[PDB]
Amino acid sequence: PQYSTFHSENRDWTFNHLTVHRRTGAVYVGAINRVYKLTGNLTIQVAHKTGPEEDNKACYPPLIVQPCSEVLTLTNNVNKLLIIDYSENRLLACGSLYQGVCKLLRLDDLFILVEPSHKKEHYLSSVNKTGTMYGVIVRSEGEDGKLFIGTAVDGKQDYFPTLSSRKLPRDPESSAMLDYELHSDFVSSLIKIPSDTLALVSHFDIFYIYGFASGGFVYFLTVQPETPDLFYTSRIVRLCKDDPKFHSYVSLPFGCTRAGVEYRLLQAAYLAKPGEALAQAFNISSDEDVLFAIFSKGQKQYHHPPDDSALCAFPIRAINLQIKERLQSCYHGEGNLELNWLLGKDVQCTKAPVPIDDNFCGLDINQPLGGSTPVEGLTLYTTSRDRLTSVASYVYNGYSVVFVGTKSGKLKKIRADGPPHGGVQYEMVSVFKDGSPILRDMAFSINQLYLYVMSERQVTRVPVESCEQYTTCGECLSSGDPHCGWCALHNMCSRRDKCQRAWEANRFAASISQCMSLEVHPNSISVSDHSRLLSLVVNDAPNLSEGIACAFGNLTEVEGQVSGSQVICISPGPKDVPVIPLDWFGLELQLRSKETGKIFVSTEFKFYNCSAHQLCLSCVNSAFRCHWCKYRNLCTHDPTTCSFQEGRINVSEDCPQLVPTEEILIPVGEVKPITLKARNLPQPQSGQRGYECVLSIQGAVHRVPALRFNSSSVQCQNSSYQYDGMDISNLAVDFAVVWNGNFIIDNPQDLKVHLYKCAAQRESCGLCLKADHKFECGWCSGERRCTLHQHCPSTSSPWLDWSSHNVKCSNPQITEILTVSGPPEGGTRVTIHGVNLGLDFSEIAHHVQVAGVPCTPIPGEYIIAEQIVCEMGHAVIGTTSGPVRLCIGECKPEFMTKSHQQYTFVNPSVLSLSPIRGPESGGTMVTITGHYLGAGSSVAVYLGNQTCEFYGRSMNEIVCVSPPSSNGLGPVPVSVSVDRARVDSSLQFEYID
Amino acid sequence: PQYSTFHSENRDWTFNHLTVHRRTGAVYVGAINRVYKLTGNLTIQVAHKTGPEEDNKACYPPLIVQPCSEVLTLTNNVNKLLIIDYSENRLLACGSLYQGVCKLLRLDDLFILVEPSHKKEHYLSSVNKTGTMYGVIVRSEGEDGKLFIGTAVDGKQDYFPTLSSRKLPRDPESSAMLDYELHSDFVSSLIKIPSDTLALVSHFDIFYIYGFASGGFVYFLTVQPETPDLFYTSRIVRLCKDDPKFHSYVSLPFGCTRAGVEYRLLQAAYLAKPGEALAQAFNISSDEDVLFAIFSKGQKQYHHPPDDSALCAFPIRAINLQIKERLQSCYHGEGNLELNWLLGKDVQCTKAPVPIDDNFCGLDINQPLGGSTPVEGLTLYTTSRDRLTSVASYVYNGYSVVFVGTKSGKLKKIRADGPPHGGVQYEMVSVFKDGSPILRDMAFSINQLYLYVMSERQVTRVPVESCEQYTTCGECLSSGDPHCGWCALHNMCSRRDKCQRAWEANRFAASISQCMSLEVHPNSISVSDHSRLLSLVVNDAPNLSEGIACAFGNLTEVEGQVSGSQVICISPGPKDVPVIPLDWFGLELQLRSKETGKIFVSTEFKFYNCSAHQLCLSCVNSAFRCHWCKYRNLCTHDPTTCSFQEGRINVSEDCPQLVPTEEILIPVGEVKPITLKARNLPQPQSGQRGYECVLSIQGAVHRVPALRFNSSSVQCQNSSYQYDGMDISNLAVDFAVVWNGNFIIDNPQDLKVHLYKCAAQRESCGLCLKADHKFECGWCSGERRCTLHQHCPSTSSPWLDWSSHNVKCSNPQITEILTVSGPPEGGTRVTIHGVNLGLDFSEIAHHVQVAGVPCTPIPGEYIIAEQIVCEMGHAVIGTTSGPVRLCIGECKPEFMTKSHQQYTFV
């Protein structure tokens, strides 16, 4: 995954600019202290040295013109401009060293041709910051050459023009090399920043981000502070290619807007062609120029632009038009020139009957010309965090593809479409692992297969395309990547020219609709059904007539027979069929193109083992075509192998099932028959044995033979059953009905036999009578145990069973009761748990008493004969504590129960609170200390009518969380109420602000 | 001495139980084959028959429920329970017949009201041995009735509960009569002996000796074998009166100890009140309950308990306390329940915060409850041989009186006092002559005057007290019998309420110090001093003002004069005074109350005869006030009757008398005066003659007048005396000195005059000189006779008298000698008797010879001049026999004697 790359010789010698020779493919890198020439794959050929050199920016004129008194420092020479002069096979390189002098280098060896340094203007600027200077070379046929150059000046407004045109004579040894194109007192090919403007506003300067030639004009894109937080303005500056007087100078703001965000800070730009979608969107020819630009949100933070940034497009035509309209309105006498930083003041437009042509190049009046109304671009794409930093674009197959660098070293691939979407990112590559921001200069290899991209530390050759990353025709043709098509027979996503035989029928899909799927019939076969002929159909296929082979996973590959989009193939033979893990086994059935040699389509093919099913219902309900052979008692794929035609079963409905009856109750140790009902029981055929019932009891499994009366009924013979443990009274046991030794009849309901021993579970009379009347299990007095009448001897007629329930059950006892203590006021909910209580609520009611005190029981809370929940009444009585009494219904001497331990009455009290004070909002953890705090059922804590949130309770303390004082700050009462008792006290709680 | 008694109709139909109706006094006896109703004095009114009936103990259910296949025998119906149901005027009687069915009988006629017999529990037990079952009826006001019953079960642990509570409805015809108070599978008003316990130990059983209700509880006292010789344990079993579930069941051992003996085998018991002494000893109110119990020594021999047995007392309060402490420690989780025969095993107590009140009636946990540490009683009394067999008690005048039966038919009356003594037996009655043991059931008549006591053959009504047996105030009030006081005027030991007028002054003595006594002055009178007034004082007397009479033994009864406690009476008159046996004569002087008619006090009164004394010394030394009248020569009580004031003698010192002098020697036929000495000789007064001396000689009594020189000396005048006979040389004669004719002066020494004759007695010279030197009688040669110098003429100076004894005598002769023969060897003691031998031994020694053979005489054996005892020397000499020779001192020719017959040697 590694691209060709070139690193800087040193960590401080950062890269600045980059250009590729359109004809040679030679790569030129403008760097600190170095100008590099490299091969296509970034192998260095020449390293031209440009620094460092001792210098001082205060030294003006430079050391090469004058000796300097200032102290010198070894200074880095920043590349500030790098431009190929194609006509003259040379390269222009200008550094920051010595006030910004320039060099001309020969392309092949970078040998210095000349270095103009005697005239004042031969020094461009002392600024040592990149992204502030840009140049454009313009040389027609009959002209020797011209250079337009714009630069920040660093306040040295008298040292350096901000924009100017220079001579670029074909002859390197011309004395006028880099001289002003025109230079007189009041008419020169240059613009100077007025002294008054720097005085008014500093650090006022003009930064030249980008420049280009289009038609009969040159264009510069600038950023500069605005003139009366610091606000900046991004502008388009236009000049005619032929205009020594600079009378054609005109300057308009520009930017773009989307989704309520104005993007006004220019970051980067690139001239390209529209592509079909934008050409239509802009109403222009497909070979007209479009300006692609990056802007950051707003008009502030020039040195650290907002991450929120946008890619925008400006048709050159739309720009020229807005410029013409401006010229026209001005030459009609409307408004002012509106360029304060230069004109210094308000200057009114002068009306003059001059026709403003498309190629109007200005006059003496109405120039230079500014303007306030911005040129609006079409916003194509925006990001919120990974700030866009660079841009390059080109047209592939009518699609405008835009490459956008990011501050984190990512490269975005945007496909440009007009409204309403604007642009779509179809890929983002991670180019620089160190996360270094992508610099402005990006350039294509001569045939646009690669895009050269740079960071401060690195130049990297990035493939325009990585289509191979899409592994299905679907992914490939829906990626949105203009370069990517589907190479059908090679099963590969690639460029058309990368797909072999792409020009032949259906070899290359350019549209999702031109993609494949594979249909097989049958889509599954019995494992025993080998050497089958299968019918394969290829949807959306190309010519397969060259030949097709079928691959059954790893198992097999046989030559298929081809007729159109239909393929016929023989399935694996006996030796080669897969083995099934114990019902089926899937694999990918694949077609290999004989034309290309590549597998290009696939689909799942499954082998099954009807034999895997060994019960009728299982076999029948298989997902695959299986048949149950009634008599042969097996599952098969081939119905003709059943013993008789009558033996074939296809649906579960007629599978020889057991129907349910009322619950099967079986006592342990008693001889009983178990009649069963069922449906479609088979008559055992020749060589087949009869029916048995198998009981799956962990302790012991019993095998009892049975007789099948008819299709509907069965019956195990008289036998007794038992299990060891005596742990559980009611044990349900799964039973399986088998015939012929191992054929188990299906049991959908999963009917089970309940083996009961009369209470393993119930030690008490109340529990037995509680249980089902069905069991017939009942309590037997003498044993003090519980079993059926059969099981218990009749000394007398009495063994007792709850007839309807009208059976009283003696000797009630109380094990333990909750809420040991309680408040004297009462209201407490006493929870009494006993063994042998009354069966009905109505009897227990009025039964309960705590000593003298009457207690009223609660119905819902009352669990028969196990537990009684009762509410105590008003206790102010003589005794401190008293025992609890239960009277089953009559307070007979046999019939009463007394508690082992006695219930104690008290009266809880509270002395103090851990935090006395707390905030009005509340939420304070209060700790109230006292005595007998634990008593009773419920607790409610009260501070100033609004309740406290309870947490935990203890004998000693109660902890709760305070409510907001809905009240005002100050003292508040604390009321605590437990049940019926409400206790109050002098300790108070103070709410604080 | 015979009490009211009732005998059994038959020798085999033994008595079993006994109860007395507190209100009617009706006596009900539970016996074999009979229930008897009797009157207070044991006269039979109704005899209700209960047997015999054909039966077999193997027949269960009984014949009245099921036909039996077992062979039947005519069976005796033993009374096993007999209880009066006071609320419902009926009686509960349960026999051994038919597995122990019960009957209810109407009190008045013993007509059967009902006989529960359809339900299993209606049959109590097949045991046919008495003293194994006991019941207690408990019926408050709002309840219809309840019966607690405990019984031995005879191993039929599934047939019969050992302890249970039953319904006793007021309505006799109730269908639930004698039904369990509560009956369910695992909760019933009953305790059953576990099967495993009988298997482990047999013949394990529980015997219920006694039962009672006290406060809010019922109590049963049991004996049973101990569980791992056979050791038995006696226990107190307590239950709350109201507790159908029997959760209140608790059981502790009990007994008592004294003098290194543990009494642990329960024999009998009885609930009573303490009496003051025990109430203080036990620190309880005098109306709290006390359990009186009999125990035998040790914990073995249940069927024949040791004779060594004890009576003990247990305050109910002390019992309840020890039970509470047990409950408390258990409900604190300490130790086990400790009742193996029932629980079967070790069961740990369960700690639970339950307050144990005085009236705690148990819960489900920690019950039934046993224990190992015994309840110790206070030992009141013990016996070693007559084994105690029964007990009953009550309080009389603050004294706890305990009645204890014995195996030999004796009834002991014990007075209970606390430590250190414990109890004191103040009486033992023999109740049954046949020696039959006293049975357990004893009961008081309604007013506790009698105690009904029974043997197997007999019911006897025994008086609580028999105070009349004490016949003197002293015996009565020192018997130690709380019932007995002294009824002064009736001279009777009795109960206070039995003494007439007991509420009047001094009529009833409750203390020995209050015993009457009688003082008389004078306490003795001369017999001649008749019709005297005497002053009688009655100490500790009651009002005598009704009248008093004095009785002088049988002799007299005269009306006395009464002033307070003083009585004055006239002594017997001349005709009626007693005669004295020859100095005095005592009799009982008695007072008879005119109010009651009874003699009630007495004291000794003596009559004397100063006249009875007839010698001065006798009269003077009398124990009574007598005076000797010197001149009138008589003893008197009245000194003013002496002749002269000078005649009165009061002390013996001046009783006049004749004093002795050297012996008075009087020769016969010689004129001699006899001077005498004496003391306080009286001067004869007017009309009185002088003194004479009278000699009392049988032959002749001589009267010689004498002169009294002074108070000290007398002398008979010159006269000669003689007596006829010549038989005895020395004749002492009593002499009496008389004056005034017949007044004889006293002679204490009884001085006599010796009349001696020169030898009437002695024919030989040796005998005279032998006699007293005093006589002066001596031998006179010429006469060949013996008389005084005066009597024999002196031809010459020679008449011979043994000077010192150095006088040789003449013509010795030998009459006869003993040991005629002798051995040649010698050594023989020769006894020679002669007439006229030597006076001294020293002369005779060396005198004696038998022929040639020397013979040595013996000093002690030698009697002067009469006999010589001599020892012969070695005889082997020539002669066979030889004559014996005596040489008085010198072998003079006149001086030698030769034996008439000769001594022979052989």
Half-sphere exposure of A785 (CA within 13 A, CB side): 12
Asked if A900 lies within 8 A of B187 by C-beta distance, the reply is no
Nearest to residue A684, comparing CAs of A632, A725, A737?
Answer: A632
Q: What is the DSSP code string of A754-799?
A: EEE-S-SS--SHHHHHHS-STT---EETTTTEE--TTTS--SSTT-
CA distance B798 to B804: 16
Measured CA to CA, the distance from residue A123 to residue A110 in angstroms comes to: 21
Cβ-contact A641, A610 below 8 angstroms: no
Annotate A386-418 with b (16+ C-beta within 10 A) or e (fewer).
bbbbbbbbbbbeebbbbbbbbbbbbbbbbbbbb
Give B158: exposed, middle or buried? Use CB within 10 Å, 0-12, 13-18, 19+: exposed
Q: Provide the b/e sequence for A859-872 (b: ≥16 CB within 10 Å).
A: eeebebbbbbbbbb
Distance from C-alpha of B760 to C-alpha of B776, rounded to nearest angstrom: 15
Does residue B153 contact residue B54 with C-beta atoms inside 8 Å? no
* CA B272 – CA B51 distance, rounded (Å): 35
Distance from CA of A688 to the nearest CA of B (A): 58
- A chain contacts of residue B365, beta-carbon cutoff 8 Å: 900
Say if CB A218 and CB A148 are below 8 A apart. Answer: yes
Q: Answer whether A813 sits within 8 Å of B354, measured CB to CB.
A: no
Torsion of CA A335, A339, A345, A351, to 10 degrees: -30
Six-digit token string for A323: 């410029």
Query: What is the full DSSP assignment across A147-167?
Result: EEEEE--TT-TTT--SEEEEE
* Contact call for residues A554 and A573 (beta carbons, < 8 A): no
Closest to B149 measured CA to CA, from B102, B204, B91, B86: B102
Minimal CA separation from B63 to chain A, in Å:
21
Which residue of chain A is at minimal alpha-carbon distance from B246?
A894
Q: How many CB atoms lie within 10 A of CB A569?
A: 24
Cβ pair B362, B247 in contact under 8 A: yes
Chain A partners within 8 Å of B186 (Cβ): 784, 811
Integer Cα distance of A743 and A41 in angstroms: 77
Q: Residue B185 is nearest to which of A781, A898, A901, comparing CB atoms?
A: A781
> Tokens 């009236």 sit at which residue?
B359
Cβ A819 vs Cβ A828: under 8 Å: yes
Closest Cα in chain B to A799:
B185
Distance from CA of B158 to the nearest CA of A (A): 14
Instruction: Measure the CA–CA gap between B484 and B111, rounded to whole angstroms.
Output: 43
A902: which chain B residues are within 8 Å (Cβ-Cβ)? 353-355
Q: Rounded distance, CA B868 to CA B862, Å?
A: 5
To the nearest 10°, report the CA torsion of A764, A770, A774, A775.
-20
Give the tokens for residue A710.
């008819």
Contact B768, B759 (CB under 8 A): yes
Considering only the beta carbons, identify the residue of B187, B353, B354 that sits closest to A894.
B187
Three-state secondary structure call for residue A924? coil
Token pair belonging to A992: 């604080």
**Each residue of A291-321: b (16+ CB within 10 Å) or e?**
bbbbbbbbbeebeebeebbbbbbbbbbbbbe
CB atoms within 10 A of CB A765: 27
Tokens 């269960």 — which residue?
B60
**Under an 8 A CB cutoff, do B245 and A894 touch?**
yes
- Give φ, ψ of A592 to 5 degrees: -105, 130
Distance, CA of A14 to CA of B221 (rounded, Å): 122
Q: Is B114 exposed, middle or buried (0-12, 13-18, 19+ CB in 10 A)?
A: middle
Technique behind the model: X-ray
The C-alpha atoms of residue B282 and residue B284 are separated, in whole angstroms, by 6
Residue type at position B175: S
Which residues are CB-contacts of A378 (< 8 A; sequence separation ≥ 6)? Answer: A256, A278, A281, A282, A312, A313, A314, A418, A419, A422
CA–CA distance, B650 with A15 (Å, rounded to integer): 187
* Residue type present at position B698: Q
Best mutation target, A780, A786, A811, to test chain B (most B CBs within 10 A): A811
Whether residue B352 and residue A898 make contact (CB cut-off 8 A), yes or no, is no
Task: Tell whether the torsion through CA atoms of B853, B856, B862 and B865 is positive or negative.
Answer: positive
Burial of B198 (0-12, 13-18, 19+ CB in 10 A): middle
- Whether residue A783 contacts residue A792, with contact meaning beta carbons closer than 8 Å, is answered with yes
Q: How far apart are CA A79 and CA A128, in angstroms?
A: 9
Residue A901 to residue B365, Cβ atoms within 8 A: no
Cα of A655 to nearest chain B Cα, Å? 57
Burial class of residue B51, CB neighbours in 10 A (0-12, 13-18, 19+): buried
As a whole number of angstroms, the distance between CA B654 and CA B620 comes to: 10
SS3 content of chain A, % helix, strand, coil (to 5): 10, 40, 50
Interfacial residues of A (vs B; Cβ cutoff 8 Å): 781-782, 784, 810-811, 813, 893-894, 898, 900-902
Q: What share of chain B is helix, strand, coil (3-state, %, to 5)?
A: 10, 40, 50
SS3 of residue A863 by DSSP:
strand
Residues in A touching B245 (Cβ below 8 Å)? 893-894
Size of interface A-B (CB pairs under 8 A): 30
Using the beta-carbon criterion (under 8 Å), do A902 and B353 form an inter-chain contact?
yes
Which of A786, A890, A894, A897 to mutate: most B Cβ within 10 Å?
Answer: A894
In angstroms, what is the resolution? Answer: 10.0
In whole angstroms, give the CA distance from residue A692 to residue A702: 10
Q: Is the omega angle on the peptide bond into residue A203 within 30 degrees of 0, that is, cis?
A: yes
3-state secondary structure of A325: helix
Instruction: Return the closest-CA partner of residue A814 out of A886, A905, A891, A904.
Output: A886
Task: State the CB neighbour count (10 A cutoff) for residue A215.
Answer: 15
Q: In chain B, which residues touch A (CB < 8 A)?
A: 182, 184-187, 244-245, 352-355, 363-365
Closest approach of chain A CAs to the CA of B354, in angstroms? 6
Task: Check if the beta carbon of residue B494 is closer than 8 Å to that of residue B481.
Answer: no
Contacting residues of B for A901, CB less than 8 Å apart: 352-354
Which residue in A900, A901, A904 has the most chain B C-beta atoms within 10 A of its own C-beta, making it the best mutation to test that interface? A900
The closest of A510, A505, A500 to A545, measured between CA atoms, is: A505
**Which tokens sit at B341?**
């025969």
How far apart CA B451 and CA A484 sit, in angstroms, is 140
Strands A903-905 and A821-822: parallel
Partners of A810 on chain B (C-beta within 8 Å) are 184, 187
> Residue B653, SS3?
helix
Residue of chain B whose Cα is closest to the Cα of A896:
B245
Closest CA to B827 of B855, B852, B846: B855
Q: CA B771 to CA B175: how far, in whole Å?
A: 127
Angle at B665 between CA B661 and CA B667, to 5 degrees: 160
Beta carbons of B182 and A813 less than 8 Å apart: no
Q: In Å, how far is B363's CA from the nearest CA of chain A?
A: 8
Is there a contact between A900 and B354 if contact means CB atoms under 8 Å apart?
A: yes
Chain breaks in chain B (C to N over 2.5 A) after: 228, 582
Are B449 and B463 in contact by the 8 Å Cβ rule? The answer is: yes
Enumerate residues 6+ apart whose C-beta is below 8 A from B252.
Answer: B235, B236, B322, B323, B326, B370, B371, B373, B374, B375
Distance from CA of residue A741 to its chain's centroid? Answer: 58
- Scanning B79-190, the segments in alpha helix (DSSP H) are none
Rg of chain A, C-alpha, whole Å: 50
Residues A775, A801: Cα–Cα separation, whole Å: 11
Instruction: Indicate the Cα dihedral angle B410, B415, B417, B420, nearest 10°.
Output: -50
Q: Give the minimum alpha-carbon distance from B123 to chain A in angstroms, rounded to a whole number.
A: 19
Q: CA angle at residue A228 from A227 to A231, to 5 degrees?
A: 55
At B662, list the tokens: 């050297």
A893/B364 touch (CB, cutoff 8 Å), yes or no: no
Is residue A869 within 8 A of residue A861, CB to CB? The reply is yes
Residue written as tokens 């008194």? A69
Q: Peptide bond before B522: cis, by omega within 30 degrees of 0?
A: yes
A782: nearest CA in chain B? B185
Nearest CB partner across the interface for A784, out of B186, B244, B245: B186
| Measured distance CA(B278)–CA(B418) in Å, rounded | 5
Q: Dihedrals φ, ψ of A374, to 5°? A: -70, 150
Q: Which of B185, B352, B364 sits opposite A901 (nearest CB)?
A: B352
In A283-436, which ranges are E strands?
A: 290-297, 309-315, 375-376, 378-383, 388-396, 399-406, 410-416, 423-430
- Dihedral sign, Cα of residue A358, residue A359, residue A365, residue A369: positive
Preceding-residue numbers of gaps in chain A (C–N over 2.5 Å): 228, 515, 582, 656
* Lookup: tokens for B119: 């339900």
Question: Cα separation of B883 and B850, whole Å?
Answer: 6
Q: Is B687 left (phi over 0), alpha (psi -120 to 50) or beta?
A: left
Q: How far apart (Å, rounded) are the C-alpha atoms in residues B762 and B726? A: 11
| Interface touch A894/B244, C-beta < 8 Å | yes
DSSP characters over B367-427: -SB--SS-EEPEEEEEESSS-EEEEEEEEETTEEEEEEEETTSEEEEEEE--TTT-EEEEE
**What is the distance in angstroms between the Cα of A661 and the nearest Cα belonging to chain B?**
39
DSSP secondary structure code for residue B71 in this structure: P
- Chain B residue numbers touching A813 (CB-CB < 8 A): 364
| A34-38/A44-49 β-pairing | antiparallel
